[PDB]
């Protein structure tokens, strides 16, 4: 398969960044694409094989190395806010019928911030269903708000009685900027879990909104008095209400 590390990175302006891409398919052709949310893919680098390295369609400050077939690491010698986006590695090999089939890696989401003191975890709050909704519709919507987070590197899930659930859930596709006129604005995200009124009204039912936040690593420096915004799960919970 095709592999990329790290899944998420936040780093200060000016620092060196290496993004790893590896695969054990024996593939000679390999690719680096760049993509901002909602935009089109731009080929940034490619490689024909074991010792090949060519500039893609979009010019970049990044360079690449293909010293070995298995590895195609992308390097950014001094990060700038402008390098903020998603970086997708791909490979393709000879399949059948005379075809090269392109396989994409999981990607790395990169944010370059001015200062690591801009990095904040989410605060998470669960809001319990309205009694007016229950009596009107026989359904019960819980809302979860994750607020005040930077970077926008967050995974929100709902858990009911200890199992992650996807049915009855909608999470905003994109987070809100708290301050749209600012570059390192913090973010908010909303999610909804809808269940039946009888399910909510069972006090044995436990409902939990969980936000995985990807932040600083144990290698990052931190001189602030506030808690170091490391990678962490922030959660909030509610139990059923018998009315």
């Amino acid at each position: 398969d095709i592999y990329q590390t790290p899944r998420y990175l936040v780093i200060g302006t000016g620092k060196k960044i290496t993004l790893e891409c590896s695969q054990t398919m024996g593939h000679d052709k390999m690719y680096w694409y760049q993509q901002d949310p909602g935009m089109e893919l731009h080929l940034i680098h490619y490689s024909y094989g074991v010792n090949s390295t060519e500039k893609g369609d979009l010019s970049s400050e990044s360079t690449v190395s293909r010293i070995r077939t298995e590895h195609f690491p992308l390097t950014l010698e001094s990060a700038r806010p402008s390098h903020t986006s998603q970086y997708l590695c791909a490979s393709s090999g000879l399949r059948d019928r005379g075809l090269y089939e392109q396989y994409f890696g999981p990607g790395t989401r990169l944010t370059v911030t001015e200062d690591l003191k801009n990095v904040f975890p989410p605060e998470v709050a669960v809001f319990e269903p309205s009694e007016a909704e229950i009596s009107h519709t026989q359904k019960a919507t819980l809302v979860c708000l994750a607020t005040g987070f930077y970077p926008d590197h967050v995974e929100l899930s709902w858990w009911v009685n200890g199992k992650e659930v996807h049915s009855g859930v909608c999470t905003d596709p994109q987070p809100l900027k708290e301050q749209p006129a600012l570059n390192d604005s913090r973010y908010a995200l909303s999610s909804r879990l809808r269940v039946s009124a009888t399910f909510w009204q069972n006090p044995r039912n436990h409902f939990r909104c969980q936000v995985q936040f990807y932040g600083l690593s144990e290698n990052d420096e931190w001189t602030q008095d506030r808690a170091k915004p490391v990678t962490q799960i922030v959660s909030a919970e509610a139990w059923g209400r018998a009315d």
């Binding site: 052709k29 893919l41 709050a125 809001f127 309205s130 819980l142 809302v143 859930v169 909303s190 909804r192």
Partner: protein, 202 residues
């Protein structure tokens, strides 16, 4: 650009089929592919065709190629919410190593829920009191309703979101508004939106 796609975007209801079009000027022509890209995710190859084939199928996706007219179509049978995605047409000029991939800009497909019984209502979600925030929920409106941003920078409003209760076999739209100020009440939250006159305000 040697690869062009149509439409730019479209909205269809679940259950309906659609057709996406791709046209290219790439010469020489070796092969043609369709990719599905979900938001935040890498593209997933659907069907790969050479000129020696006029048809390829991948479950509900069926791709056609007329290499003479340099046109391909992707047909989706019985569209589902999960079909909402970017669809990318890519063309390769040569079969060998030294060939190049040419990407179209993509087609954005949005699939809407079929809402038979809209019951638009704005509800107040009991104050967390663990949180200083008050939350209002606009729910059960038809996909025709557009939710607007607030006219207040201390009031946050999210766009409409489709939720699928895959058991009651029920789908519903909702939008969320919150603010921490004393001003904020659910009666005003969505005032900047054109909401249906029959909207329930408990």
């Amino acid at each position: 650009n040697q690869v062009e796609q149509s439409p730019q975007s479209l909205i269809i209801l679940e259950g309906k089929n659609c057709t996406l079009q791709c046209n290219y000027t790439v010469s020489p022509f070796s092969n043609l592919r369709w990719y599905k890209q979900d938001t935040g995710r890498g593209p997933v190859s659907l069907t790969i065709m050479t000129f020696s084939e006029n048809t390829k199928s991948n479950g509900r996706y069926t791709a056609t190629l007329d290499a003479d007219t340099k046109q391909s179509s992707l047909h989706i049978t019985a569209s589902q919410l999960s079909d909402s995605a970017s669809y990318i047409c890519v063309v390769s000029d040569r079969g060998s190593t030294l060939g190049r991939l040419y990407f179209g800009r993509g087609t954005q497909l949005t699939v809407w829920p079929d809402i038979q019984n809209p019951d638009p209502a704005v509800y107040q979600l009991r104050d967390s009191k663990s949180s200083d925030k008050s939350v209002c929920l606009f729910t059960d409106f038809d996909s025709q309703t557009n939710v607007s941003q607030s006219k207040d920078s201390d009031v946050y409003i999210t766009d409409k979101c489709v939720l699928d209760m895959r058991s009651m076999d029920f789908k519903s739209n909702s939008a969320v508004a919150w603010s921490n100020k004393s001003d904020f009440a659910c009666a005003n939250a969505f005032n900047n939106s054109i909401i249906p006159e029959d909207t329930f305000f408990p």
